[PDB]
Amino acid sequence: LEAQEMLWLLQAVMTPERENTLRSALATSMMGLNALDIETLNNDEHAWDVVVEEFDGYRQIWRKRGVMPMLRALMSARNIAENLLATAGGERRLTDILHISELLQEAGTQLESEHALVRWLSQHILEPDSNASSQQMRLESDKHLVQIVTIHKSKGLEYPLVWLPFITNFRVQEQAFYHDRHSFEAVLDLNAAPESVDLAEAERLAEDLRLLYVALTRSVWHCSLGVAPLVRRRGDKKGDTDVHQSALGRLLQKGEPQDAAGLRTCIEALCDDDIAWQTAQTGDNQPWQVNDVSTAELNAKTLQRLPGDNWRVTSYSGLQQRXXXXXXXXXXXXXXXXXXXXPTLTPHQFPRGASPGTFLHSLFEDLDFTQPVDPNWVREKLELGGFESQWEPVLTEWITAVLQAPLNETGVSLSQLSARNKQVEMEFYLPISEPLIASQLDTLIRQFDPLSAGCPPLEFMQVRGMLKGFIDLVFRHEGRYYLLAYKSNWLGEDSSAYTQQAMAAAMQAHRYDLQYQLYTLALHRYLRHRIADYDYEHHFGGVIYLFLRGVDKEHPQQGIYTTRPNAGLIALMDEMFAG
Amino acid sequence: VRELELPATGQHTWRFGLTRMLLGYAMESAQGEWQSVLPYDESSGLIAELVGHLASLLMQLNIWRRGLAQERPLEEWLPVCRDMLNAFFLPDAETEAAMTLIEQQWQAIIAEGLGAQYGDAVPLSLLRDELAQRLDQERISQRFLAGPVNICTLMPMRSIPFKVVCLLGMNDGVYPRQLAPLGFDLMSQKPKRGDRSRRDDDRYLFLEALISAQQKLYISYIGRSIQDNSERFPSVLVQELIDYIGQSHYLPGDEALNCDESEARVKAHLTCLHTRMPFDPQNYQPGERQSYAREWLPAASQAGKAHSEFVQPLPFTLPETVPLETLQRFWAHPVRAFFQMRLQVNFRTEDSEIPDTEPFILEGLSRYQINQQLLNALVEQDDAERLFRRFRAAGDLPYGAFGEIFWETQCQEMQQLADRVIACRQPGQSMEIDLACNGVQITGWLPQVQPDGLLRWRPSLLSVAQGMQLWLEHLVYCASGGNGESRLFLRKDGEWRFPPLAAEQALHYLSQLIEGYREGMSAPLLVLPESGGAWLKTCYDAQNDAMLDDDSTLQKARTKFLQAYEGNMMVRGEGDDIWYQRLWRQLTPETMEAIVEQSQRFLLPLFRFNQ
Amino acid sequence: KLQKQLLEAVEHKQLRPLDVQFALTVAGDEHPAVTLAAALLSHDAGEGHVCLPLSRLENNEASHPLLATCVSEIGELQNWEECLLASQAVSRGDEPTPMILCGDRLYLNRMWCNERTVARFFNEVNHAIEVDEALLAQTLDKLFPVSDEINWQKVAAAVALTRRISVISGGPGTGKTTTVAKLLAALIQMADGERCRIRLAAPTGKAAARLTESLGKALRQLPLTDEQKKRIPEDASTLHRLLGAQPGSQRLRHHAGNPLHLDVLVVDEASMIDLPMMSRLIDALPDHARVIFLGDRDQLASVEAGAVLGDICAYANAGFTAERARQLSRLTGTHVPAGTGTEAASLRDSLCLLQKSYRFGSDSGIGQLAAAINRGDKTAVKTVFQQDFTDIEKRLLQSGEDYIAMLEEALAGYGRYLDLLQARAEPDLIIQAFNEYQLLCALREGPFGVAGLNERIEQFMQQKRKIHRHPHSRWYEGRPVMIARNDSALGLFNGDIGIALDRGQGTRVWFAMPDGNIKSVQPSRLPEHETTWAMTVHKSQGSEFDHAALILPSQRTPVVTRELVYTAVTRARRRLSLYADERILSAAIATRTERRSGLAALFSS
Amino acid sequence: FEQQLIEDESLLRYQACADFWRRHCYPLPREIAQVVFETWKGPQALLRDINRYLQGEAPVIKAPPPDDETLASRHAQIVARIDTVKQQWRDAVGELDALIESSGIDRRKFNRSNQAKWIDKISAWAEEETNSYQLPESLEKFTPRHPLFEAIDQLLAEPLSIRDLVITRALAEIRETVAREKR
DNA sequence: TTTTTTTTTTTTTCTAATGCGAGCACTGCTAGCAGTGCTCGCATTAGATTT
């Protein structure tokens, strides 16, 4: 029944809004509420609202932390885990509850839904099966227990004191199945002809003997066993006692039918100094005398120091995060305007998500800049990507527009870059030593940064640790390095919605500002490391955000964006991350 | 159906069901069968839209199961996965990541095939079970060294110096891990130096982790199966380790004892046996090992108070007007009432799962409903054949011959009962009832009052609860005019017949009932309409109109009581019900008496006037 | 076959998938005329038409050249009655057949049975009840003070007292409910010694509550003894609860076997009664029961398939039977006009139409405009144009730069409310304030719709400081919400509004009961809720706002119709505003909602 | 090389039993079906009867029915086996040649009315209890009569059933089918 | 392309065995009758594994 109660609870916490499906869960013996409790609790609205509330917090624990944490919280608050142990026998019940919970984990992970779990539990309430893990655990190992066990499960075991209460009993086999004495082959007679029935019932009896043997050899010191004038045939008073058909009876009577008196005598005959027989006399005094237990004072220790401080390895993505409060930070703009005004080979139409972008990037990852584009190569990329041929002629053109676009003031063409000057997809780890506080930074940002005037100060919790990132591309031109990052996005637009203004707008919207500054710090330290006699101002060329969709043969500016870190911002920033 | 070589039936197939649904949309079920399909009434409205959507699913499910059957060369399998994904699925912000992985993996498999130049047609069951292996092959190690305490499996060639290394599940046979060599491998026959074999890998790892921990090593294994208290064992490695410790060290207590004795002594000191349950108070006894969980503390201290007896008296005030349906609904199961009626708790068991097969035989409420319809047809002396066709078309009966057989044993039982019903039946008109009983106005309706009296018939077994029902419904009838008898006929020729009664005794017994009713809403009155009925069957003697006393029978009524309470291994006993579970988990001989006393109070006038 | 043909109309979205699948199963393998014909039957029946007169399907031939489809083999099958009625998927009503062909109108078996039940119930079943005309006339005279002019209401009471089944039609605020109270009073006071069992039913629990309070307050006014005040009905219920519809099944605890036990039954707002519920009702009535329906002839029709009250009141235009006019002239003590000619005596006599609206007259632009709705658009552009009436205004919405301005006026529409929240007031006056102004949009979703306007308006609350919002909580103070489905526990019904606010005890929603009491419900407690800044026209039925604002989308959609706009117009108590294109609106008014049923034919034969 | 184990073999097994009882029972005409019905209602019970024999090594069946015999064959056989006794008892009826004895109670002749009545159709599978009276082993204990009087003993010597054949066919089939589906 | 309602209960095994009760034929004892031996039939009671 405890599985059922669990159902009522989970089912309630799932939708506490419903008056009935909650109250049902409250009435459960598990909750341990009187009739007076439920009665009053049906009257005062405040209390009822409090209950509804607590379950509503439980749903929260349920969604965030999983299941077992919830049921834990419920058990603590309701005090049930204690009140059961107070109650007599409730120890067993409590074991069942814990066990069920432990299973709700094992099935809880594999199923993603909160709701499909309540789906699952019912289905198991219907069909219990046989299976091993869902089989009941032993109730308590604290107290020594009576280990009540079937014969077959006693084989090869040892039991210092042994009881065979019902041993007299027998079952006359009506089914006819036996072994031929000659061929020794298992033979079934589908026909009831009495011979084969006999040939089998002899077997049933001999087997019963072997049961008796095994049962008697189990004991070490003492074994007791019951004996009765059992009567199978339904006639009351005869002088027929069928005990000779019992395994044991045949051994006492030497396979001879007797009366109950003869039974008693044949018992009395062998009884010397080992076997000793007493008449079976029902009696009841007291269940048993526990005399109870004494324990102690006891307490739980409690941690003093914090469990641990903040050390985290994060990317810039672990910085924007989300904002709890008046301002929430999202890439997209909440405000929307409706439009009431009323060739498919375009870049804006390309699919969107992490998946499409990862494809777009992965092109340029192996892609060769100095050679023009091979449409076959395209088709076999899209084919690998799973993208149809609807793309290949649409792509192979566009890419060339990308590779051919001149950049910055130097006017560099991506095409002009030799693989000696390319570095593709640099992963870096940048340590941040003392905790990095937002406001202690964004002032340094805003101070030297025109772009950081936009939007509030970035907010991220105190962090100390490592920082990760992938430079899309790094290359040197005219002995002067550059930093290149691809961005795609923009579901809504195709045309000049990418300008000098709107690019700088979106940069401030997705906070790519802090991002490029951080990379520049990384690339800076990496050059300072690698290049003997490195200087920021001499060797460094600025930062380039390239919006892939942004590239258009018509406008050289659209889609490309370049800014230089002040060299006065990095000077102080690097120091900040050092200490 | 015929594809699996099972005889074509024409029922219980998604075609049968759908056709039954649509036809349920066009025409009401009461009109009748059409092609020998019974229209399914439930979707008659705009809701029925869903059906068309459903039926559009299955068509696809049908089409594709044909398209996938034949083997194909690979480049014939290339386009499939796309048609199927975009066919059955509408991608979303979450899913597109997944679906792209499906296409990517699938087409990766096939591409592996083509690039290898493999011509022959391929069965689908080859690829379906490749792709299953391909989709779960991936692992996510991303967060490894992020800094949150690290949980992870033992991986070869990954050894990172740590201050604290924990090892779990060292039970023997779980670790090291075993994958045998293929068995036709030649390498495993004659090894050279640099061969790698999984077992030696694990055995070496357990050494790495030892060398790596710079302060605290922590090793754990399950000693005893929690479930059966069986024995379990440590892995052989842990065994060797504890051996080496115990042989290399001695506790400072005994500096001269013995090699082996100091050994088992130490090995006892290093091994901790944690308890079976968290609330075991040993955990919290102040000392070295003490648990930080404060949530189980009051449990271990055993400081909680036991659950009080569920029943507490509650105040109640009987209104002036009690709708007779309220009384009826009460006396059917007087315990269940006080939970649903009074304090509004009702335990709704989960609905039954869809059965997995066309009905072979009818049992339970399934066949009960059929007996109800069938009987109500025979009593009207309407033809049972028509209704038979109705069920057959409804797909409700076993197929074909057995439909006819089962149908014509049932017609033969319900015919027997049917006649006995028809014998006394005089058509009659319903009557409305208003009464003053103990200053309480009862209003209600009794359907079909014939001049002779109350006639009711149910295709059930003779049981008391039915009796109580006819008793209430009778006394209210005598209570307002209505001279005549009251009779009830049941299966295996059961009958309840109550002689007419004068308005005096009528109102007096009805008083006793109502008083029962206000008794109920206050305390969960314990009257078991069957088990108590069984106990009162033995004791009462109709010839003397007095319940017997002598203790010989009083151990008959107890055995016949418990026998009725808890059931056989065949029939479920009255004693097993959720409503009686909430009151007591186990029947005390005291509570037995408590039931016998009240049951003796209300039930007796039943058997006293039954004839 | 033509199957794959029908696979196209789904891409064309001219056929619901249900339609196609149905035609496939039932139509079977027959001549494609059968298959297509059936699919069209399921389609028109899906949009809510009861029948499919063969004229339309043979004349259009839009889905296929029904020459080749209709002319198959076996000589001339081209007769649609011939080809169709040949197959077993169609019959004359003799066999248990999916489809019925009766009056040239092919249509579903279910619709044909329910259809017939309705018909026979309105024609033959209802009877003439006879009483003293002098005494009855005196009772009415004490009910209605003014004898000097023809009173429509007094006619209505007289009619409903004479005829067993009777309907009373009229616009909103034309005084229906009061009239019903007058009737019921005449009923109780009419039969002194006989048991008079009154029952009050409404198709929606919300409207049921409105009726409870309405007839409570209205019946309390008129003098009655404690006996009559015992025979005053207690409460009104849902139509379903009355029939006791089981939640899962289609079973009914009444139907034909159990007549529900009544004397008279009053179903308010009968416009929402659809055909299936109408028939399933009719089966529950006894032969002594007097039933009365309430609703506007032009009110927006019921959602599920049919139009009952519309097809019925359409015959009111003819007027009373010649003699019945003289009878009522004796009854009301007036001259009752007589409709010329003979069409159906029993039906024409049962219908009364209330043409006087005490709420506002012809000088008010709402009654003139609403009265101009039933006519052509050249009257409506006129009215909206000339004089402005001060009660009606139209704002052109074409470019979104107009839409922003619409929202701009929406602010001041909510102004008093918004301030009363900023002023930090008590809940009652706030709730009463929220009912002065309301936005009504036809569609649910998109740029113009309840779902879109909630977003855009709240965003427009974030642009201009009015009410602050927290994204994480989702329950910022001041947001009005409404209930999705009825609830027995909290005593609040679907279609009801409440205001989310923090009194300082906590964030709590406040509802106004029909009893004037205010009940605060925890957010967790609420069953279902939807942000209520904008209502669909449908859900707004029965409500009254002092200033309403209608919003019609730019496109042309089958939802936007005449009756929709009509209800929107009658919705405002006094003030009204419109946002529409003169072309979209002006064409919308010209297109009347028709749902084809044989009723028009049935009552004439 | 990779075997996926399954510990629930009762569901596959039951599945197969329903498959058998579908293909070998649904085709039955009314009259044979009537006989199948008595011995078990439906495969739910049949499975319960043969279940210990489906598992583990297949037993050997003593004196199995020939492989080619169907249900209709066995049934027609038993039809005629009873039919001969039906005609015969109808022919020898109406005569007391027996030596009348007390313990054999004179109303035993009323039994004969039953039998001459009981002989109408073959549709029943159950011969009447009164037939036990006409056994020469029965009566001679209390008058050899004529042969058919002894033929009833031959008729009642071997119980008349379809059981063995169905348990045989089903036991051989369900075993295979399971093995195949698991393959 | 729009949308409304409503709350809950039901049943339960089959086969077989005996104990007695009722009715009858005979046979022996004192032609009929009482008893006994007998025999069938109706209701009631009991029991249905093992990894």
Residue numbers in the entry:
A (entry chain B): 591 to 932, 938 to 1174
B (entry chain C): 511 to 1121
C (entry chain D): 2 to 606
D (entry chain B): 148 to 289, 304 to 344
What sentences appear in the manuscript?
The RecBCD/AddAB complexes are highly processive helicase/nuclease machines that digest DNA from the broken end until they encounter a crossover hotspot instigator (Chi) sequence. At this point their activities are modulated to produce a 3-tailed duplex onto which RecA is loaded. However, it was shown instead that the nuclease domain is actually a C-terminal domain of the RecB subunit, the activity of which is regulated by RecD.
In order to understand how the RecD subunit is able to activate the nuclease domain of RecB, we have now determined the cryo-electron microscopy (cryoEM) structure of RecBCD bound to a forked DNA substrate with an extended 5’-tail that spans the entire RecD subunit. We utilised a DNA fork substrate with a 25 base pair duplex region, capped at one end with a five base hairpin and at the other with unpaired 3’ and 5’-tails (3 and 12 thymidine residues, respectively). Electron density for bound ADPNP is visible in the ATP-binding site of the RecB subunit. Electron density corresponding to all twelve bases of the 5’-tail could be traced from the fork junction, across and through the RecC subunit, and along a groove on the RecD subunit. The 2B domain of the RecD subunit is visible in our current EM structure and confirms the fold of this domain is similar to that of the SH3 fold observed for RecD2.
